[PDB]
PDB file of C-alpha atoms in Angstrom:
ATOM      1  CA  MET A   1     104.019  98.606  89.195  1.00 44.32           C
ATOM      2  CA  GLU A   2     104.075  99.871  92.719  1.00 43.44           C
ATOM      3  CA  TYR A   3     101.028  99.890  95.024  1.00 47.81           C
ATOM      4  CA  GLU A   4     100.576 103.184  96.945  1.00 44.45           C
ATOM      5  CA  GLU A   5      97.914 104.445  99.444  1.00 43.12           C
ATOM      6  CA  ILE A   6      96.057 107.816  99.336  1.00 43.76           C
ATOM      7  CA  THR A   7      94.036 109.039 102.303  1.00 44.95           C
ATOM      8  CA  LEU A   8      91.275 111.269 100.941  1.00 43.82           C
ATOM      9  CA  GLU A   9      88.574 113.072 102.863  1.00 38.71           C
ATOM     10  CA  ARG A  10      85.424 112.683 100.797  1.00 42.68           C
ATOM     11  CA  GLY A  11      84.526 116.396 100.730  1.00 42.71           C
ATOM     12  CA  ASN A  12      80.918 117.599 100.741  1.00 41.55           C
ATOM     13  CA  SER A  13      80.940 116.854  97.045  1.00 43.53           C
ATOM     14  CA  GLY A  14      82.899 113.637  97.209  1.00 42.80           C
ATOM     15  CA  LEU A  15      86.492 112.302  97.091  1.00 39.74           C
ATOM     16  CA  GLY A  16      87.783 114.419  94.152  1.00 38.80           C
ATOM     17  CA  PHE A  17      88.864 112.136  91.281  1.00 39.93           C
ATOM     18  CA  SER A  18      87.187 110.105  88.538  1.00 37.83           C
ATOM     19  CA  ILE A  19      88.289 106.544  87.785  1.00 38.52           C
ATOM     20  CA  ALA A  20      87.879 104.477  84.740  1.00 38.73           C
ATOM     21  CA  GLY A  21      88.064 100.685  84.853  1.00 41.73           C
ATOM     22  CA  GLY A  22      86.362  97.679  86.468  1.00 42.70           C
ATOM     23  CA  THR A  23      84.704  94.361  85.809  1.00 46.45           C
ATOM     24  CA  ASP A  24      82.022  96.197  83.828  1.00 47.66           C
ATOM     25  CA  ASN A  25      84.036  99.052  82.310  1.00 49.19           C
ATOM     26  CA  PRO A  26      87.322  97.781  80.840  1.00 51.63           C
ATOM     27  CA  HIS A  27      88.791 101.299  80.714  1.00 50.54           C
ATOM     28  CA  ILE A  28      92.107  99.410  80.096  1.00 49.78           C
ATOM     29  CA  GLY A  29      92.882  96.868  77.397  1.00 49.15           C
ATOM     30  CA  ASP A  30      89.756  94.783  78.033  1.00 51.03           C
ATOM     31  CA  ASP A  31      90.510  94.140  81.670  1.00 50.21           C
ATOM     32  CA  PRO A  32      88.851  94.703  85.037  1.00 50.46           C
ATOM     33  CA  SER A  33      91.774  96.843  86.039  1.00 49.12           C
ATOM     34  CA  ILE A  34      90.371  99.902  87.818  1.00 48.20           C
ATOM     35  CA  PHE A  35      92.479 103.022  87.183  1.00 47.23           C
ATOM     36  CA  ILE A  36      91.900 106.763  87.441  1.00 46.60           C
ATOM     37  CA  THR A  37      91.405 109.007  84.556  1.00 43.29           C
ATOM     38  CA  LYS A  38      91.276 112.458  86.060  1.00 40.46           C
ATOM     39  CA  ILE A  39      91.225 114.271  89.445  1.00 38.86           C
ATOM     40  CA  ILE A  40      88.858 117.133  89.829  1.00 36.37           C
ATOM     41  CA  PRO A  41      90.542 120.424  90.962  1.00 36.44           C
ATOM     42  CA  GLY A  42      89.022 121.823  94.220  1.00 35.61           C
ATOM     43  CA  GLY A  43      88.171 118.467  95.694  1.00 34.46           C
ATOM     44  CA  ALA A  44      89.614 116.338  98.433  1.00 32.57           C
ATOM     45  CA  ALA A  45      91.832 114.660  95.901  1.00 31.83           C
ATOM     46  CA  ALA A  46      93.122 117.753  94.202  1.00 35.24           C
ATOM     47  CA  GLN A  47      93.117 119.579  97.556  1.00 37.57           C
ATOM     48  CA  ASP A  48      95.258 116.902  99.068  1.00 35.81           C
ATOM     49  CA  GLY A  49      97.476 115.889  96.220  1.00 36.27           C
ATOM     50  CA  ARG A  50      98.375 112.404  97.322  1.00 37.53           C
ATOM     51  CA  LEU A  51      96.897 110.627  94.240  1.00 39.71           C
ATOM     52  CA  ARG A  52      97.753 110.690  90.558  1.00 40.00           C
ATOM     53  CA  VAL A  53      95.537 109.954  87.597  1.00 40.86           C
ATOM     54  CA  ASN A  54      95.857 106.656  85.849  1.00 41.94           C
ATOM     55  CA  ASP A  55      96.363 105.095  89.317  1.00 37.03           C
ATOM     56  CA  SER A  56      94.944 101.520  89.206  1.00 37.06           C
ATOM     57  CA  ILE A  57      92.805 101.144  92.292  1.00 32.35           C
ATOM     58  CA  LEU A  58      93.794  98.088  94.230  1.00 36.18           C
ATOM     59  CA  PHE A  59      91.846  98.632  97.449  1.00 38.98           C
ATOM     60  CA  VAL A  60      89.376 101.120  98.930  1.00 40.28           C
ATOM     61  CA  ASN A  61      89.034 101.596 102.691  1.00 39.53           C
ATOM     62  CA  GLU A  62      88.704  97.843 103.111  1.00 38.86           C
ATOM     63  CA  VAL A  63      87.553  96.613  99.714  1.00 38.50           C
ATOM     64  CA  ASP A  64      89.416  94.643  97.039  1.00 34.89           C
ATOM     65  CA  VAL A  65      88.671  95.958  93.535  1.00 34.00           C
ATOM     66  CA  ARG A  66      90.549  93.118  91.978  1.00 34.39           C
ATOM     67  CA  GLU A  67      87.270  91.756  90.691  1.00 35.12           C
ATOM     68  CA  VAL A  68      84.774  94.613  91.085  1.00 34.89           C
ATOM     69  CA  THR A  69      82.780  96.484  88.406  1.00 33.08           C
ATOM     70  CA  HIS A  70      83.820 100.026  87.511  1.00 31.85           C
ATOM     71  CA  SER A  71      80.712 101.129  89.231  1.00 31.12           C
ATOM     72  CA  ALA A  72      81.722  99.137  92.329  1.00 29.98           C
ATOM     73  CA  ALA A  73      85.089 100.850  92.239  1.00 28.67           C
ATOM     74  CA  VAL A  74      83.450 104.199  91.813  1.00 31.77           C
ATOM     75  CA  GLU A  75      80.926 103.387  94.492  1.00 32.33           C
ATOM     76  CA  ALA A  76      83.953 102.324  96.637  1.00 30.89           C
ATOM     77  CA  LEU A  77      85.347 105.749  96.605  1.00 32.02           C
ATOM     78  CA  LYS A  78      81.875 107.007  97.497  1.00 30.22           C
ATOM     79  CA  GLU A  79      81.556 104.282 100.186  1.00 33.21           C
ATOM     80  CA  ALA A  80      85.013 104.889 101.484  1.00 34.31           C
ATOM     81  CA  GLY A  81      83.282 107.177 104.007  1.00 33.38           C
ATOM     82  CA  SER A  82      85.247 110.384 104.402  1.00 34.86           C
ATOM     83  CA  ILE A  83      89.063 110.270 104.775  1.00 36.18           C
ATOM     84  CA  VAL A  84      89.657 106.950 103.100  1.00 37.98           C
ATOM     85  CA  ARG A  85      93.028 105.451 102.316  1.00 37.71           C
ATOM     86  CA  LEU A  86      92.771 104.305  98.706  1.00 39.36           C
ATOM     87  CA  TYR A  87      95.258 101.820  97.156  1.00 39.85           C
ATOM     88  CA  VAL A  88      96.264 102.217  93.599  1.00 39.04           C
ATOM     89  CA  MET A  89      98.940 100.933  91.118  1.00 39.73           C
ATOM     90  CA  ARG A  90     101.827 102.923  89.612  1.00 39.92           C
ATOM     91  CA  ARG A  91     103.877 101.878  86.632  1.00 39.37           C
TER      92      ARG A  91
END
C-alpha cells in the first residue's frame, strides 16, 4: 500500500467525501483502519479530484488516525480547517 496526500478545501458544505473506518467503526475487517467509502460530487473532494474512495486515512492536517475513532477521523476532515492535505493508503 502507498501513502498519498490530498489537499482539499473544505467547501462551505465540507471537504467532499465520506469515510468509513476507525477505532469505533471497523469499516474494514474489524480494524481501526480508516478508509473512505464515497466522495460526494460537487464538493471540494469531487471538485478537486485528488482523492479516491477506499483510501485509508493515515493523517489529516496534522493528526494521526492510526488509533482514532471513525468519528475522530470524520471530525479530522471537519477539523482540517479548509484546504487540508489528507494522507490516505492505496493498495
